[PDB]
Every structure is written in structure tokens, then in C-alpha cells.
Amino acid sequence: IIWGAYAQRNTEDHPPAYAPGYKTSVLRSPKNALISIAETLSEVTAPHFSADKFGPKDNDLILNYAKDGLPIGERVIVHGYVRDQFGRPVKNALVEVWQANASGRYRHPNDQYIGAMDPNFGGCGRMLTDDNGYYVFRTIKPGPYPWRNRINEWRPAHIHFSLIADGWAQRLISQFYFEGDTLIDSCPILKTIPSEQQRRALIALEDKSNFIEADSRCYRFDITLRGRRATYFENDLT
Amino acid sequence: IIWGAYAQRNTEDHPPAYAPGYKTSVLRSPKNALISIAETLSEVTAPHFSADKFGPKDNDLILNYAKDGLPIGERVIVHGYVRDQFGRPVKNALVEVWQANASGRYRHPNDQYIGAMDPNFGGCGRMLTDDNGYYVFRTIKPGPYPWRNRINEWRPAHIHFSLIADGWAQRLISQFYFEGDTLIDSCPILKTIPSEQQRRALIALEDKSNFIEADSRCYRFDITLRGRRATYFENDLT
Amino acid sequence: IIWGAYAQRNTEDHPPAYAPGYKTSVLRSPKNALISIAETLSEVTAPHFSADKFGPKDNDLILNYAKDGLPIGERVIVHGYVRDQFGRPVKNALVEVWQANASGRYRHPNDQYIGAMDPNFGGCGRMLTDDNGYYVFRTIKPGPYPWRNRINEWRPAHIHFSLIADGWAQRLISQFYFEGDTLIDSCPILKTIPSEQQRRALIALEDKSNFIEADSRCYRFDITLRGRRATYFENDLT
Amino acid sequence: IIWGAYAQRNTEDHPPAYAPGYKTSVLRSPKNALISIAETLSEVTAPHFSADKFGPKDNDLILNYAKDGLPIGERVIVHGYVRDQFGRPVKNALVEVWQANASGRYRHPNDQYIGAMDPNFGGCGRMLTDDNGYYVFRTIKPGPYPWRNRINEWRPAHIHFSLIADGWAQRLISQFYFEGDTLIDSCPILKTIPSEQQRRALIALEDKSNFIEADSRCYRFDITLRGRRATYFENDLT
Amino acid sequence: ELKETPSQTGGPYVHIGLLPKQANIEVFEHNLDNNLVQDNTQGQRIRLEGQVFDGLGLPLRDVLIEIWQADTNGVYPSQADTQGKQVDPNFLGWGRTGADFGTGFWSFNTIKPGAVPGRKGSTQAPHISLIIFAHGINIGLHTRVYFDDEAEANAKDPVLNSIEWATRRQTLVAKREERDGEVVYRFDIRIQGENETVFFDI
Amino acid sequence: ELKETPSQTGGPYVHIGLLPKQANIEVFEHNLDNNLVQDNTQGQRIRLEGQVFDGLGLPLRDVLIEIWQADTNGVYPSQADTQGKQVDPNFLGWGRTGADFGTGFWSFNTIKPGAVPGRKGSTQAPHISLIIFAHGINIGLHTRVYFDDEAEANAKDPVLNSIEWATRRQTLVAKREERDGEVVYRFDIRIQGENETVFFDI
Amino acid sequence: ELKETPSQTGGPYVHIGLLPKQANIEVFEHNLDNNLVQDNTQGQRIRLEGQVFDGLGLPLRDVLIEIWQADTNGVYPSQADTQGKQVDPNFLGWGRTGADFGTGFWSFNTIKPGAVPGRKGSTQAPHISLIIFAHGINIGLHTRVYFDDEAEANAKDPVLNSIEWATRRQTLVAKREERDGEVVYRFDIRIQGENETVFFDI
Amino acid sequence: ELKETPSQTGGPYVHIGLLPKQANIEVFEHNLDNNLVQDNTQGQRIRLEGQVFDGLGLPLRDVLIEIWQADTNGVYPSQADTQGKQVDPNFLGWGRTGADFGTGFWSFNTIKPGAVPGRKGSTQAPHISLIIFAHGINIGLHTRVYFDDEAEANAKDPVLNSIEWATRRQTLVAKREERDGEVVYRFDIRIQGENETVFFDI
Ligand SMILES: [Fe+3]
Ligand SMILES: [Fe+3]
Ligand SMILES: [Fe+3]
Ligand SMILES: [Fe+3]
Ligand SMILES: [O-]
Ligand SMILES: [O-]
Ligand SMILES: [O-]
Ligand SMILES: [O-]
């Protein structure tokens, strides 16, 4: 199999750069249209990260920053599969996550929300998907938090995530939410996404048979990256 | 206005005593039917609790047990009205609440769940409704927690509440849940209630215009107690 | 009751500043997003206007400018209630109105429409709402009129109105229309409002039982202003 | 992959122990609730049965007891897959079946129904599923038969089956029925199952492309057992 | 018309959440308890005690119990009391208690109540109204405690006579005992089974 | 809960309909105007003036402007003022004006306001709240006017510091000038474009 | 995700269909039975026997019973056993039996099992897992058999201590008896009623 | 076929969550950073630095930037590189950095990349691929950095020639400077407005 380029990103499936209801986008969006290019080796390659470099608690946000005790909050496991648009698993992709603690507070002096800091919660994790594109991490469910867009704006609970996979063209950062959170329906950030079906694609689902008794709940969340097409006639990449 | 008896409790609007899916009810439910009685002064009177006795933080679960800092978790205000079935406000009723902390842990040695204890959260509050039947308290949103009914059972997040109002016949203890929590659909305790409309009556609703910017969310939850009928012909109570 | 801030204005319930179908908005709309602020005494206070200052015909546009006779046109009474978003009446608010005459002509040299001027019609009125938030004025139904947006644009009949109430944050100017006017469906100004339910909120309804026989018709029109939230914990306003 | 416990059995997907319409259950059902336990090695292990021990006709009920001729009745093949709830095949599980003959008569002195005995039919078979969880046996379609529950009760045609697989917690005995049998709608035993979708899960479907011309019909019937969850954090089993 | 909010069990920590002081959660300055006798309270002091048993005879240690009763003259300290008689001013008439964790016994220090008017001119025998909440109890169970030394009044009580099984009436009668000058009424509650206590829908 | 009535532009005659006296429509005996100074009003008299510009730099001549401010001691003549300080009794705190048809200049005769408390114990620098309505403006635009001679107070103002672009803060500062003993603050408003004035959602 | 296939009773002939050899249906050369001891099997030989009773005390004669247990060293002959200890190679660990038609007694010839690890480092007392199927039983009933001569180990067993009624724990303890040099454990099972045997959802 | 998961902004803490070590959150032993030069890495060392500006010219201090590039011989350290040439083994080709909180400057220590094949036999001028994430940026913005000292190669670059506005091509060319023997390429990024940097949909 000789690989060609990644399928074109479908701009209608993503938020536009300029989205007036998300006020900060007004001054941080290009006025010119993006220039589309035909792909080259630069766009279809990406770096490789070795498993050796990861620590044993890198994907366990409950314990990876625990000092005198456990962090306070709802214990949850989040798992799922990363695959490309043609349904092929994405192997050995670097998945990084970051989030607020149970009060909705980020561990940084910049965040001055009154929600309380947790001395035993850090809020960063990472892992590599396996051969089946599977990933799993454990954490504390983040709490929703206020921000200044309109004065009384509130983000639904969410975990930020980032993927570096096989091609630079697949590079993606996004955020997922939790089934049933009522703030999901009012968020200006989530509403930058044009269609309802794509907004639903960022909601992690309760996975009840996978809860661990007397221990943790579990949410299932799959991720889809752009996929490469195979070439059977002329290979123009090079 | 001469008051007569409280309207009959509608047993179809409540859970039955014997509810096999809630295992602990099997040995703690009477085999005989309840004996219904015509009311007397004993059933239509109740105690009075004076406002003097309450402290200023009795209805503020965020601060009433705070020692070195604030409790960890989602800051929420819960408010609403207590009225009787005929729509009259219930004035000066004692409303008491108790709940787990953000991890789903109760502040008692009996609870040995691994969810972490919060040294700054107590989990008990109380207040008297006002002349309009209004009540308001502030707290940390409780986290869901596991319990042994079937091995992997989980309670949705909930706050336990108790009311002592004008008549002993109104005495009621129950629990309310939070809009959108997915565990609400699987709870054997909530399912002891026969009808869907009554199950919905225990769900507190997000009250977005009443959120306090950069501070707390708010949930609205009204409570209905049995009401008294007025007498216009013979007064048999005595 | 200690009052806190006004609930946040819901920008999705109002027209956006930039609305290309209303051509004059193109050069008169800010390119930057509005900066939302937390309220202070400046935003929650407003002026008071004393009843003494009003004349007896201030709310009677039929007679307040009548010189040699009565103005020509349809005699109508318009009444209703002004309340805040939480349903509380708005007392002693200053309501000011202005409008064209029956031909659709405004009493000013700037307006050069061929629709005829009426020597006995002025077209301005004012009143204070009462303790129940009620207001009532009498006038001549305005006629629709042409304007240059696209060359053949026509405004539906409308009466402009303005409210100064308890807080500066409530300040509002808008326009109401009359039930069944067919121009309502084609107006670019009314269409700047994003939702159909909010467009309907500006339509005054025929109030047939309140017509005055052999005299005048009547339209009912209620107005809703932003409401204040009550504070029960920390009062940060000051 | 380190395996943890089997997912909890979903009691709402099974019949309750006490089912008054199936009269024999009245005195053979516990009055106390089942006590749920956290699993140990005892519950997640099971025995292994070697293929060597099986004869060549163990899964051929048509020939395994044939003496002077063939049994009388409808020749049918039944096949399908055994998988766990997470969709994984169940390999080398022992599947045992037993049934009445074409007249609805069991080969035992206890059964005194007038339906005739067949000297060439035994009515017992067994087999091990393969690596894909597949099983296949051949038999005579059993006839329905009367029993004393209410005086005129009749069982739909059915084949009893039993599975011993990887874990003792998967142990299951049940019965399957044949598509379209009208007695399925009236059976008190099948009706002990609370939901319609689960009742349908016991109906074997006509598999017409798999009929063997001038020989036998075929029914397809899949079976689902409880599945194990994988452990990625603490392994508490031991 | 509205429907009454549906009841739910008090759950496993009802006796901790409603009596925090006793579970060492010191959130309140003034705490509610099981002692209804203030120093100037009138009437004869009595102790009411017992155990609550499940269907197998096991005492419940997670139960929460409250009682409501009239003062020594049979008047309730409630604005809804219409007798027009003045009530003892140093009497709340209500109290709350849990079971001792080890023993399983619950108790109240109170006053023996006076007779209260019944319907249509009748007179009820002295009684204390009692309600029980616990994990496994979906709706608070109401019962009444009568006294074995009031046999005459008990025989004419409207409510007791409402029960057709003479044998069940006895489950509502507490037994008087005298522990060193103190008067004690023993009242065991059997939620289910033999000698099941009568419960009322009031 | 109800939704706020939706805003609509004031339209082309908003400055005639809300200031009839000035358009020669003599319907009212008492008319509202742009003069907030009554004879016994306290504080230093100032004149506030400027022009409002559209996106191409053209001044608007159909604009209607109102201001709301505190008295000389920073107290609002409003029942909602909770400072517990007595307000100047000869001060309305509000005024309304249109632009001169030829020139395009608008103005108010008022008093320089005193500092008003901000949230959580802070102090706001002196400011006047201003709102603009006109044909093409769908919702009244809110802004504030601060004074260039109050640089010290302005540097500690909560609202001004809310704006991250130091460069946009300056659009809210009026310039002091002295026209023959009279103090004048020039404040031009640019609705769109370069040096666009900051507007608030209050 | 799929739902588990729903259980159905084994029905009146479950003990004939799963033990054909004994009902004289000679269809199989190798038949499964109630004897778990092969000649080289290690451990002390014991006989396990008893009766199964319905709610009126009548023994069931149509019952089918299976047991699952560890070998003499507490290792299961299963690939899922993760102890890393070698299991006795002449031990299946499983057996099946029906009740004698006349008497109603069922039995197994087996070996007394060794202790098996419990969760989180605990040790379970010796036990045999047992399941019962019969006409009228909609879902196989799971229970365990413990031994009265292992009182010390039984007092520390995780599962037995999971049961709050000390009185129900005893229903899971079989009684040791010595019939002519043979060791026998008598274990009667009461499906319903007084001294109802504890059943588990595993 | 599935749809790509929709992008969302990195949000205000993207530069803290993806570079925890620098925000003093010491959760990982091995941390990713902005230094691509290991000791045996081949090629000429260069420093790449600049600022990212919003539409009003304010530098962003909450931006997160990553670069992806080829080694000194124009080979990518990726299994998807099909040139069949061996890549420098002491080169990751990727790095991540945030802006300094005070200054707003971001930087990387790397190697000047060699030319990489373009499509259909063409040769691309040396370039580094760069992506920008930040609060307010809904989808990562892709751009490339070319070098002003490679004018000859730049004039024949397929991608640069894809841009019809000669004037926009220049926004992708970094300026070479020599700070004490160190070679530095200054590349400022303007997200919006005059001299807006070209961004690509790749
Ligand atoms: Fe965030
Ligand atoms: Fe609870
Ligand atoms: Fe108009
Ligand atoms: Fe059968
Ligand atoms: O609870
Ligand atoms: O107008
Ligand atoms: O059967
Ligand atoms: O964020």
C-alpha cells in the first residue's frame, strides 16, 4: 500500500475562526481566507514519542500529583478509541489532557476564581494509544467554572485534549464534555460548532457496565482524526 | 376560617413500603397494611422552632464547617418554595438538609468509601421558610457514590431533606437530585416511586438567570406538603 | 431584602449590532465586542421623575396637540403592564412614545414624504406606570411609511417607545407593531431580531372587550425589563 | 491484559425468583434478597472440558440414539455464536441441550403424556464452541406439550440449554423457542421475563439460506454471556 | 392542585445528618435532641425506651426516631391546638433520637402526657405519636405509644378501638417499670413479622 | 421567567420624539433637556461636549444621547443608592441631548461627579455613564466618560483596569480645556474603526 | 453492548437431561457425574451430602446441583487462576448430581478444599461453590458451603463477614460427621422460609 | 465514514496544560520543551523567535506554539518519510513553547532545515511548519517560516508561489540576525489586520 494525501479537512464540520458570540475570537481570527495547499512530505509526517519516556502514573490524574492524600472529587475513568475517518485505528498517538479540579479551578496563579484549590490535584496527564487505538486514563471529574465572555458565562465541565498522531495534518486540540451536563446547551464555545451532530461528538457517554464497584464511574469517548487515502495510480507526493 | 383535617395522603403518589429492587426494604417493610385513622388534634398539630436558635451560617454549608480554608467542589445555591397541595405557602417550616461532600463521602467513620474526606466540609444545614414559603441555602454539589444493593450500584448526586411544618401529618423526609444527572435513570431508590411525573418532582432545575457571576450556580427546587381543608358545616375534629 | 445585580442581558434575545440587511447599521456598529462588566452602584441606580411635572394631556396624543379640531385617523387606546423578568411590576417608570401621523408622516421638516401632515397631530406622549406597572395612552393609529434601505422599503405601522425605570441597566428603547399588519413579515428592522418568539413580543394585540363603543379600539401590549436578583450571602455590590 | 471482575448481572434483564403466574415458583423462591458479593478467584474461574471426551455423534440428536431407524419428526439444524456482553467470542464453552421428542414427550417414566415415545430418539446432546464461539447441532424439532400450572397450560416447542464457560459467574441455563410458534405469547414461564426485548432474545430464527436441500431446515440462535472487564489501575482481585 | 412531594428513605446516614452534634459534627450552637424536660416543665417525668427490630429480629442501629406529644394537661404546644386552654410554656412537645450504636437501644426523657380530646366529643387515652425513618424504610412509619397503667382509658380510646384485631392493639401498649425511683416505659417496635407493630396512615 | 422585550433602533426621529420642544413640537409644559445644573446645585460646573462619528468619520446628526451620574459627593439621586449618605437635593443626575443639526456637536451643562464606591470596597474614579441611540444603532450603546485630570484615580479604577488593551482605555478619557473661565471636557465618540470607543454590556 | 441471554428454569427434567446416563439414556460414552476424586487426587477425601427443601419443608426430588471448588492447596484447575501455583493435575474441581428419587438426598465425593486468596490480600476460609437448578427456580441459585471444623478461618472470611445477620451466616456452615472412617459434611439447603439458606448474586 | 472530531479552542490555560513543568506543575519526569538540539545533532544551530499579535497589535501571552521540521539533510524523523535517506538519529524534529509572560516573546533552539522534496519532482525551499493555539483561536492556525537568506530557493518554492499576492508571501519570510555569534531568525506573527500572516489549510 502506497499512501497518498490526507483527505481534505471538512470546514463545515468545524467551528469558523470568526465567531462573534465567543468574544475573544473577534481580535484573534484572520480576516483573510485560509490558503489551501496540496500536501507534501511536510504535512503527511509527524514526530514519534517513545513509551520509555512516560512514567507509570502519567495517565492517572488521581495519583500523579497526590502528596498527603487523595484529591477531593468524583473518581472517574475515561476510555475510548482513536481512529481515522476511514475507521482505521490510530496507533501510538500521543494523547495529552489538562483540566480544572473539582471546584473548577486550574492550578495556576492566573486563575483567581474563588472555587478552592486542591493541594493533591495537578490536572495534567498523557498516554499513547495502543495498537487498537485504545486509550484510558483516570481522573477527578472537573467542575464547571465562570469566565468573562458575557458577565455571567459558565463553561460546562470539560477536559481539554490534544492529539499528535501520524501526520502533521491530523494535529488537533479540542475539549470533551460529560453526558447530561445542562451547561452544554448554553456554552458559546461549544456553540461555535455549526451542527448539532458535531456538537454531540464531543460528549463523553456514561459507560455503566464499565464502572468499578465501590470505586469509580466510567465515561466512553471516541476520537476521529483525518485519514489518509491510498494511491493506486500516479504517486504525486514526491 | 375553621380548619378541618389534612387531605388524605395519596398512596399512589409515593413509593410502596415493600420494594424488592431496593434490597434493604425487604426486611424493613410491614407485612400488614397501614391502618388509616380519622385525624384528631394529635395529627393536625406540630412543634414550633424559634428563629433565635439558628446561627448565621446554619444555611451555608460552604462556610459553616470551614476551618483552614474552603471546601473543595462546585459552589451552588439551592432555593425554592414550600407550599401545601392547595397552593398555600408554608410559613416558618423547619427545613433540614444533609449530604455527602464533593467526592460522595459522608463525614462519619461508617462511610469507608475511597472518595476523599474534605476537612473543611461538614454537610448539614437547616433553615426556616419565610412568610412566602421561600427557603435558600448554599452548599457544595455532592458527588454520586457507590453502595451495596446489587454490587455495582451508584446513587445519583442528591441532597437529603426533611420538613417539619404545621401538622404532624405533613412530616416528610425525601431526597432531591440535579437536572441531567444520568444516574437518575438507573437508581433503584428513585425507582421505588411508581410514576414518572412524581420521579420528576424530585429533580432540582438549573436556574441560570439566578447564577451569581464568578461565584456560584443555582438550582430551583419547590416542595409540596399535604394541605388542610377548611370546614364550613360540622366541625368534628373535637 | 438586599438587592444584588441585574441579571445578565441575554444577547441572543436581541438584535446584533451589525445587521447587513438594515444598511445604516453597517457603518454604525462597533467592530469590537462589547466589554461586559460586573455591576456597581452606577448601573443599578437611575433617576426619578415626579408626577407633578406631567400635564393632564401628556398621555393623550389625540388631544395634546389639537388646535382647530381633532387629528384625522383611527382612534385607539394602547395599554398594558411593564414588569421585570422575574414578573415583578415596574412602578413609576417613565414611558415615552413618539410616532408618525395617520399618513405615516413625522412632524419635522426632515420628513418629506408625500403622505399629508395633520395640523392637529403632534405625535409625542409620556406617562409613568402605576403601582401595578400599568400604563395607558390614547392616540391615532400611525400609518406605515416608505424609507430608503432597498429603494421600495416600507416600515409596518409602529409606535416608538422608551423606558427609564429603576436601574440604568434596564434602559431600553424599542418599537411595537399592530396585530395582523402584513408589513411585519418583510421589515428588515424587525428581522434584525434573531428569533421568531422575540419578534412576536413586539406585536400589540387587539383587546376587543376593551374597545369603547362608538369611540375607540384598544390594543394590549406588555413590556418586560431586566430584573434584579436578591442577595442572601455576601453583598459585593459595595 | 489483566482481567478484573465480571460486569454485574442486570437483574432487570432476567426473571425475578418469585413469579406467581408460574405456580411452582411460589414455594421455591427465597423470601430474602440475594446478597451481592464482590468477586474473587472463586467466581471468575470455571472448569475445562477436553474435546477427547466427546463422541462423534454427541451433537447429532438425530443419530445419537438411533437403533432400528431414524427418529420421526422435523429434521433441523440449529447453529449460532456464543459471545460475552462486550461482544468477545466465548471459546471452548460446554453447551449441553435436552428436549422432548416430536410428540412433546421426554424419555423418562415420569412423563406420562399420551404423546407417543419414539424408540429412536434420546433427546440429549452436547458440544464445545470453537474459537469463534460457534456451535452447531442437529435434531428433531420438539413438539409443544401440556403441563399442569393452570389445567390447560401448554409449553411452546423449546430446547433446554446449559452453558459452562470461562467463569463460574457466567453459569447459565435457559430455553430457546422457534420463530412464529403461537404458544410463545401465552407461556407463563416465558412471561416471567420482564421485558419484551429479552423475551425475543430466546427466539431462534429461521435461517433459510442455510437450509440443506432435500434434507433439513436450519435455525440461527446466538447466546450472550456476562463479560469480564479489563483492569488498568489497581488489581484488587487478589 | 399539586401532588405531595414523593417520600424517599432517609438512607443510611439519616441519624447522623439530623443529629450532627452526636456524630461529632459540630456545625450548630443549638442542637435538637431527645430530652423534652426543661427544669420548670410540669408533669411526671418518665423515660421512654426500646429497640426497633427488622424482619429477622435484628435491632436497627441506623434508625432515626421522633415523638410528638401533648403536655401534662393534654394540650399541644402548637398554634393549631384549638382547646383554648393554656399550654405548659416550658415544653416543646417534640424530640429526636437515634439508636445507641452498640446496644441498639433508643430513648427519650419526657413527661407522661395528659388526655387529649378525640373527635366528636370523645376522649383519647394518653399517647405519644412516634415516627421512624431508616435506610430501607421508604416512607416514615407512624405509630403511637399508649401506657399499660392507663388500661381504663385505653379501653375507651377511639383509635385503639379502630383496630379489629384485639391482638394487634397490644403492640401499641408500652410496659411500665421502676428503675430506682425513675419511671420507665419499655416499647419495642417490630417492623415486620410476628407481633408486628401496628402502623398508621395519618 | 420572561424574556426582556427586544431592543429596536430609535430610528431617524429619536432625537425629535424624545426632545419635542427642540423640534418645535410644543406638546409639554415641562421639558427634559441637557442642563443638569439648577441654581443651588453643588459642585464645580463643567461643560461636556463632543461629536459622534460613524465608520467613515462622518459626525451623526440624528443621534440622541443621555448621561447618568452621581452628585458632587459621589452619591446618586436614586432610591437604589445604598450609601446612606444624603444626596444633593437640587440634582437630578440625568439629562438628554441631541446633536446640533449643522455642526454635529452635542453638549451637557453639568457638575463634575465625585468618586463612587466600586465593588468589594474599591473606589471608582469619577465618571459619567453615557448611552447613545440613533438610526442604525440596534441597541443603545453604553460607555463611560472619565477625566484626564484624574489620572491618579483613573489608574486605580476597577472598570478601566478591566480593559486589557491599554490603548483602548484611553478612548474613555475626556480632555479638559478652559474656555474663558468655563471648564470644558471634550469627548468624541467613534462608533466604529480606528480608535473605536469602548462600549460596555452593563 | 449486548444484554445477557435471559435465564429460564431448568424445568422438570433438568436432572435427567444433564445426567442422562443415570436416567438410563445411554447416549454418551463419557459421562459427567458427582465424583471428583480420581485415584491420584491429593487431599483428604470427604463426602458432601444433604437435601434441598421447598417452602413447606418438602425435599425436592427434581433438583440438579453442581459444585465448583479449589484443590487441596487452594488452587483452581482453571486457566483463569492467577496464583502462579501449580494445580493438582488429577482434579477437575467440578461435579454434578441430582437427588435420589426416593430419599431426596444428593451427594458428592470430593476433597476438602484448601484456602483461596480473597480480595486485596485477604484469605478466604475453605469453601465449595454450589448452584441449584430445578422446576420453579427461574435462575440458578448460588450459595457456598463452609466447614464447621474451620471455625477460626470462618471467623475471618470476607464473604461470611459480608452478611450482617450473624444468624444467617450459620446457614452456610456444613456439619462434620464420621461414618465409619469416612468424613461426611451434612449440608441441607432451605430455599424459602425459616432458616432460609443465604443465596448470592455473584 | 466518520466525521473528524470538531476542533475547540485550547482555551486560556493551553500553554500551562501542555507545558506543566514550566508552570511549576511537576507531574512528569520527562518533559517536552522548545529545544530541538541534542549534543550530537547535526546542522547549523539557529534560534527562532518572535511575538504573536492580535488585531489591535497586542502580543498574546497565552499562546502555545509547536514547530515540525526536517533535519539538516531535509529528511523527516518520521516513519512516513519515504525518501529512503537515513535521518539524523539525534533529532526529534518537533518542539513546543509558550510566550514569556512578561515580554510576550516565544522561541525555539533548533537547526536550520535542509530542502525537502515537493510534489511531482519539485524542491521546496527550507521551511519549518508552525501551528498556533490560544484562547480565542477555534482551530489551530498553520503557517510556515521560510528564511530571508534562501532567496534563490524561495523564489522557486511551490507553496510560496501558490500565493498570488506577492505582498503576502513576504509575511512568511523570517529575518536573519547575528546576536554574538548566534544566528537568530525573527518571525513575528500577525493574526489579523495589516500584514496579516498567511495561514494554510493543510
Ligand atoms: Fe478549561
Ligand atoms: Fe445519601
Ligand atoms: Fe418610525
Ligand atoms: Fe421442557
Ligand atoms: O444516604
Ligand atoms: O422612525
Ligand atoms: O422441561
Ligand atoms: O480552559
Side-chain angles (χ1 to χ4, degrees), chain B residues 9 22 29 39 42 96 174, chain E residues 4 6 76 96 127 192 202:
Chain B
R9 165 161 283 169
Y22 177 14
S29 55
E39 293 184 345
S42 301
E96 298 169 278
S174 186
Chain E
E4 185 179 11
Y76 284 98
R96 178 136 81 200
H127 64 270
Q192 175 187 92
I202 75 176

Side-chain angles (χ1 to χ4, degrees), chain A residues 144-220:
Chain A
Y145 57 81
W147 63 298
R148 181 151 71 134
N149 181 59
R150 283 174 298 189
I151 201 60
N152 214 345
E153 218 75 77
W154 286 76
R155 293 308 319 291
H158 59 277
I159 282 175
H160 294 271
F161 69 96
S162 169
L163 276 101
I164 298 178
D166 297 282
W168 196 241
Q170 299 180 117
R171 189 81 186 77
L172 177 72
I173 278 184
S174 186
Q175 311 175 22
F176 66 83
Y177 304 93
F178 296 88
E179 208 184 339
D181 182 328
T182 50
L183 287 171
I184 284 169
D185 296 310
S186 298
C187 184
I189 289 177
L190 182 51
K191 287 196 268 61
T192 57
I193 291 170
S195 79
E196 187 74 4
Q197 47 186 159
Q198 280 293 88
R199 291 171 190 177
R200 281 192 294 261
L202 296 182
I203 301 169
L205 293 320
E206 180 183 273
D207 192 356
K208 209 161 173 312
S209 301
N210 279 308
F211 283 12
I212 298 185
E213 61 280 357
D215 185 340
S216 299
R217 308 194 336 268
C218 177
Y219 283 86
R220 169 71 188 273

